[PDB]
Amino acid sequence: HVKSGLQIKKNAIIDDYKVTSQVLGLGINGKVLQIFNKRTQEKFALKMLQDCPKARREVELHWRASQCPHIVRIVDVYENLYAGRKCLLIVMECLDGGELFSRIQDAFTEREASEIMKSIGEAIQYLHSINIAHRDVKPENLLYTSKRPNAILKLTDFGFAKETTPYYVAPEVLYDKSCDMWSLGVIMYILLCGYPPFYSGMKTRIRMGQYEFPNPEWSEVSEEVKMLIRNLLKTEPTQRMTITEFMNHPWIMQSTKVPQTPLHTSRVLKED
Numbered sequence: 001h002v003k004s005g006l007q008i009k010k011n012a013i014i015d016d017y018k019v020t021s022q023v024l025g026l027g028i029n030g031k032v033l034q035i036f037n038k039r040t041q042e043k044f045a046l047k048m049l050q051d052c053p054k055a056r057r058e059v060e061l062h063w064r065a066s067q068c069p070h071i072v073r074i075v076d077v078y079e080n081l082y083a084g085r086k087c088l089l090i091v092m093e094c095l096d097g098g099e100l101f102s103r104i105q106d107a108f109t110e111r112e113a114s115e116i117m118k119s120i121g122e123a124i125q126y127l128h129s130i131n132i133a134h135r136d137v138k139p140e141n142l143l144y145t146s147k148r149p150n151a152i153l154k155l156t157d158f159g160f161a162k163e164t165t166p167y168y169v170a171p172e173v174l175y176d177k178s179c180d181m182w183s184l185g186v187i188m189y190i191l192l193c194g195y196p197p198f199y200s201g202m203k204t205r206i207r208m209g210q211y212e213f214p215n216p217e218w219s220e221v222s223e224e225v226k227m228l229i230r231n232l233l234k235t236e237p238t239q240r241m242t243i244t245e246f247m248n249h250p251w252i253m254q255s256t257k258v259p260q261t262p263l264h265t266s267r268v269l270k271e272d
């Protein structure tokens with residue numbers, strides 16, 4: 001009930017880790033390069049930011065969200081001089097299980113889709129409960145821990161993350177959060193059929209809310225699931241479902257009762 005604060009080291013990371021050049025990705029702040037712990041031989045990944053009140057916010061918001069099982073753990077944060085300017089080196093747990101849809105791409109059922117959505121939801125539920133929005137919940141930022149079947153799906157990259165701030169008093173007497181709820185709707189839409197609900201012109205279709213549940217990809221999918229997507233992909237954010245309501249929806253709470261109906265998502269993804 002009282003977790004430690006960010007220790008934030010000052011000594012060189014070259015002392016503790018052997019920094020290689022095997023890049024795991026790029027993105028919103030800087031590339032992620034793999035390192036190795038010199039004591040043991042464990043992997044870990046290194047994200048590299050330059051020190052400036054903004055990247056120093058990311059490390060702070062990530063550290064709070066890190067206590068959640070479905071968010072990448074940051075193992076240590078270093079403050080070093082790279083080249084000749086202040087930098088924040090974030091050391092995170094290794095996630096070599098691939099991206100969410102990279103796994104799916106090689107049966108896959110609605111139940112499996114339901115279970116995945118609960119994991120992503122638990123990360124968002126924790127973020128919102130402590131007043132944090134992710135603002136960039138996309139397929140690329142959702143990575144598995146290992147290749148083993150049973151690995152935990154974790155949310156990553158807090159670069160766009162921002163803080164959102166009697167017994168009878170109302171909540172408004174005390175909307176970046178809704179942004180994430182749209183995202184879950186997109187992720188859930190792609191999880192069920194294998195393609196996104198909007199593509200190309202496209203900018204207009206996203207504003208209008210013009211999408212379909214076409215056959216054959218949605219033929220087997222229930223109206224209960226379609227209506228859940230409708231209430232996540234609303235044009236008006238205040239008309240949109242909240243994370244507490246999402247986690248209390250029967251399709252998410254009882255992932256086990258959801259039938260093992262086969263989806264096209266594996267085959268559809270396979271064709272680029």
Ligand SMILES: O=C1NCC2(CCNCC2)c2[nH]c(-c3ccnc(-c4ccc5c(c4)OCO5)n3)cc21
Pocket residue numbers: 024025026027028032034044045047072092093094095096097098140141142143156157158
């Ligand atoms: O902050 C991050 N921003 C963006 C990405 C995810 C979207 N694609 C570009 C990199 C990212 N990925 C990671 C990350 C965190 C922990 N582990 C790994 C990782 C480790 C080994 C891997 C791997 C990913 O994929 C290949 O083998 N990546 C952090 C970030």
